[PDB]
Amino acid sequence: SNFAPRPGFGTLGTKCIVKANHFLADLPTKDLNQYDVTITPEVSSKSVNRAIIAELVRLYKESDLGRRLPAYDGRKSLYTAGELPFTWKEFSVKIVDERSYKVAIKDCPQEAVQILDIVLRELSVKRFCPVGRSFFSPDIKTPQRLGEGLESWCGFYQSIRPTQMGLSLNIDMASAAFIEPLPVIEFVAQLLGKDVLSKPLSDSDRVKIKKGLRGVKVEVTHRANVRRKYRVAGLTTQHTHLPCLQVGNQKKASYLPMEACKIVEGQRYTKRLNEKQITALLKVTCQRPRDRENDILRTVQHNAYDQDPYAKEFGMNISEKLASVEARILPAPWLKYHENGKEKDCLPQVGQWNMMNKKMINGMTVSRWACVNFSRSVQENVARGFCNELGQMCEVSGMEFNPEPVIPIYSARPDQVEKALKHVYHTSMNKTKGKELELLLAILPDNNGSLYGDLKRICETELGLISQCCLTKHVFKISKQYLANVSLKINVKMGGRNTVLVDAISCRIPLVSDIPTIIFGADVTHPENGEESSPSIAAVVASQDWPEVTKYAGLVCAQAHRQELIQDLYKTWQDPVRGTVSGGMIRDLLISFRKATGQKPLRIIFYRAGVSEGQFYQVLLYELDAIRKACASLEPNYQPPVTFIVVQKRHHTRLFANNHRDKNSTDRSGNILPGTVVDTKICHPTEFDFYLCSHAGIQGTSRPAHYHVLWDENNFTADGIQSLTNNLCYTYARCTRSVSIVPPAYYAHLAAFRARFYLEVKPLPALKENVKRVMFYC
RNA sequence: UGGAGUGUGACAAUGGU
RNA sequence: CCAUUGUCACACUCCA
Ligand SMILES: [Mg+2]
Numbered sequence A: 001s002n003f004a005p006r007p008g009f010g011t012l013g014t015k016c017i018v019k020a021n022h023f024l025a026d027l028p029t030k031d032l033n034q035y036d037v038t039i040t041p042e043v044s045s046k047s048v049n050r051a052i053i054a055e056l057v058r059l060y061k062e063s064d065l066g067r068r069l070p071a072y073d074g075r076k077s078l079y080t081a082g083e084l085p086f087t088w089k090e091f092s093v094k095i096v097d098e099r100s101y102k103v104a105i106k107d108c109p110q111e112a113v114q115i116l117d118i119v120l121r122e123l124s125v126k127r128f129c130p131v132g133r134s135f136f137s138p139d140i141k142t143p144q145r146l147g148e149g150l151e152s153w154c155g156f157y158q159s160i161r162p163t164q165m166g167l168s169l170n171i172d173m174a175s176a177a178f179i180e181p182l183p184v185i186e187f188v189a190q191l192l193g194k195d196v197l198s199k200p201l202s203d204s205d206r207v208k209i210k211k212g213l214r215g216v217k218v219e220v221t222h223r224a225n226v227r228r229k230y231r232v233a234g235l236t237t238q239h240t241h242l243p244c245l246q247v248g249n250q251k252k253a254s255y256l257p258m259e260a261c262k263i264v265e266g267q268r269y270t271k272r273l274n275e276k277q278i279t280a281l282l283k284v285t286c287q288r289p290r291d292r293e294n295d296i297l298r299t300v301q302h303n304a305y306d307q308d309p310y311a312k313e314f315g316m317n318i319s320e321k322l323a324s325v326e327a328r329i330l331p332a333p334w335l336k337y338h339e340n341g342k343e344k345d346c347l348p349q350v351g352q353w354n355m356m357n358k359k360m361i362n363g364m365t366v367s368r369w370a371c372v373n374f375s376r377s378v379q380e381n382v383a384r385g386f387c388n389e390l391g392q393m394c395e396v397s398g399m400e401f402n403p404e405p406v407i408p409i410y411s412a413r414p415d416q417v418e419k420a421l422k423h424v425y426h427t428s429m430n431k432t433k434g435k436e437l438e439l440l441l442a443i444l445p446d447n448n449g450s451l452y453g454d455l456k457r458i459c460e461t462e463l464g465l466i467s468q469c470c471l472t473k474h475v476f477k478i479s480k481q482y483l484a485n486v487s488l489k490i491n492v493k494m495g496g497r498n499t500v501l502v503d504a505i506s507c508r509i510p511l512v513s514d515i516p517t518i519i520f521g522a523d524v525t526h527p528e529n530g531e532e533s534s535p536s537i538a539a540v541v542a543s544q545d546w547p548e549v550t551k552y553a554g555l556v557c558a559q560a561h562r563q564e565l566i567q568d569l570y571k572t573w574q575d576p577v578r579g580t581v582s583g584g585m586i587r588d589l590l591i592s593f594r595k596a597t598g599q600k601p602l603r604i605i606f607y608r609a610g611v612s613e614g615q616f617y618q619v620l621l622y623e624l625d626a627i628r629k630a631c632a633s634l635e636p637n638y639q640p641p642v643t644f645i646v647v648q649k650r651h652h653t654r655l656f657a658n659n660h661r662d663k664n665s666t667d668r669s670g671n672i673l674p675g676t677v678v679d680t681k682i683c684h685p686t687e688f689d690f691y692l693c694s695h696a697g698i699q700g701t702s703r704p705a706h707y708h709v710l711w712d713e714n715n716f717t718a719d720g721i722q723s724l725t726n727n728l729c730y731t732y733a734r735c736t737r738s739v740s741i742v743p744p745a746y747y748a749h750l751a752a753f754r755a756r757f758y759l760e761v762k763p764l765p766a767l768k769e770n771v772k773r774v775m776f777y778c
Numbered sequence B: 001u002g003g004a005g006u007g008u009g010a011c012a013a014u015g016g017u
Numbered sequence C: 001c002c003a004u005u006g007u008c009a010c011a012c013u014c015c016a
Helices: A046-059 A061-065 A108-127 A184-192 A203-213 A275-285 A289-301 A309-314 A380-397 A417-433 A451-463 A472-476 A480-492 A502-506 A586-597 A613-632 A718-728 A743-758
Strands: A017-019 A022-026 A150-152 A159-161 A168-170 A177-179 A232-235 A245-247 A254-256 A324-326 A369-373 A439-443 A467-470 A517-519 A521-525 A536-541 A555-559 A573-575 A579-581 A603-606 A642-646 A689-692 A705-712
Touching: A046 A061, A108 A159, A108 A309, A150 A275, A184 A203, A203 A232, A369 A380, A369 A417, A380 A439, A380 A472, A380 A480, A417 A451, A451 A467, A451 A743, A467 A480, A517 A586, A521 A743, A536 A743, A555 A743, A586 A613, A603 A613, A613 A642, A613 A705, A689 A718, A705 A718
Parallel strands: A369 A439, A439 A467, A517 A603, A603 A642
Antiparallel strands: A017 A324, A022 A168, A150 A177, A159 A168, A232 A245, A245 A254, A521 A536, A536 A555, A573 A579, A642 A705, A689 A705
16 A cells, blocks of 8 residues: 655754755646657667757747747657647658658646656756766866876766655766867877877887777868868878878778877767776765765756756746755764673764773683684794784683684695585594584685685585684784774674663663564675576574664575565475475574574564665565564464664765864764764655664765665654664674664675575575574674 | 775666656 | 666775
């Protein structure tokens, strides 16, 4: 039917003013009429068809139409200011640069602003040039060259969206690099970086220049007045040392001097960017959020939708100022640490912190391990020193480490990885009278080349041993931060936890810490390798302790090729021995939660990540039906209130600060503070969703996460969801900062990306039991 | 593959005509 | 055709 409505706006948190990029567009719903084309031929060239329509209209702008400027999308459709008096016009206006075109002519906001978007694209095409959807214009921000002849301006790309303030036009900034409009002499001088007038060019250099100039339009300069432009037919094999240029038809071999041509501002694309060019473009493409806001503001002031014949003939209005919206800043939560450490409560300042004089909540006390060395550079002494230093860092960071390994560090070679792992596991099994190995510190080389894949495939699919890898350069140059951040992984990998929310411990967080609640997750990772052969694999994670929700336990399965839905939540196959057996992922995760806590969950919160607005409804229907069926098949009369929350990240809605000279910014990359929520004036007006940016920026802008709360049953308040999501966004296991998208929907993608190595329709090999209950993937 | 983030390229899924 | 999103790869920056 319909999604879950909005139960209001929040009030808690501080106040601040954020200026997003959503220019409100006063829609002119006076009158708009569509039309069509009755053409006997067919032209597939968008630009050519557009020129045709323009010329044909000019041929009869005032003769028959009358004081009108009709539009044209690019298909069988024309949009005017109304219904024109004529009904049976006949025109066969040809184009000369050649077939007769015989013709016989015969809810309020959506259609009107679809016409608005059509005329927007028409204006952009008429003024600037088109390129992969995004229009780019030179005279925007003083374009400058970044390479030999490649110079990059600042383009843009609009998209109307039916937001809350009345539908609004959107704007973003995209950059492309095109060749400079300079004489060929200077172009060659900059390309080769050497003297060219007195120094003859080599054959390889000549071939490179010919390839670079292939397809480049050139205008003759030997004529003062007739500077006709021609396409480059080729370069002749034979300052007279400069080879002649072939233009025109291949049969009509015309030779011109290299100095008798010029660049005609190339249209589509230049030669593929190199390493030295991509770095400069990256240095220029993304700037501080202040500069991003300035360019977004400028690209509409320059484009000037206000003063335009189309705007005059329709009345459409777009304010040249970015939208100003109020957006509360949620407060950071309190974190409880083990009492043995100097500090027991640390609050995150700007969304990040470090464990100075702090100790993890639970130390799993690893006492058996081995270190396998997959390299020739690092040797026994260096590997033993690295292991000892990691042990000392782990002991000072919270859990006891056995100072000496079970077996001496078994050096090996990359090719015999299976033999090395088998020997190490079996030797250490033989010793200690058969006690399983807690962890193995692999040390794999810099450019492993599937060694990492083979290692993390064997150690989990076949052996059942929790592993941990470190590159060679880190071993050679160890740092306290690096050792601490690997110690966090080692601690969470053994079923322990290291950070816990103070609110959850006290059982005070709303609608979560009063009855058993499990916070799920989901994601997919398509193969992008061939077609119909490599299955796309799906992952699901779920919490496994109610008083504090920090421990997850994921499990993965393969599914059909490039299917976005999580194919198998609840699958039933006939089994004559047992009957109509059930299974999937939901049954297994609920069973694991029940075993690991004691009480069946009584409220499911689900964080399905990565779906499109086009298929929100279909994915909601299928996943929620699967959840209901799975839970109903676990115990009769067991229907927990589910709460879908779809997470999106790749969205083109930025967020800046009202004044960029104040304390309303982070330490660096002075965009918004970590924790802002913007659920007013930029969102789906009738569906409950809210932007959010829980992660401190580092450079460039900060792409806020766009949570889109789908079907909701247990009646969360909007402030309740915002607070719970921001708070949950802090308890990240493998890091000490604040994550962008919440860990329940982060671990899913992380485990799905992990599971791609397990394969080598066609389900993946199962994970061993003793590496499933713990966070193997993280 | 210590981790977090934001730029680009390539490829891909889905909604309306 | 017009979009909304996703995966992968590379580059850069930052952490005690
Ligand atoms: Mg993902």
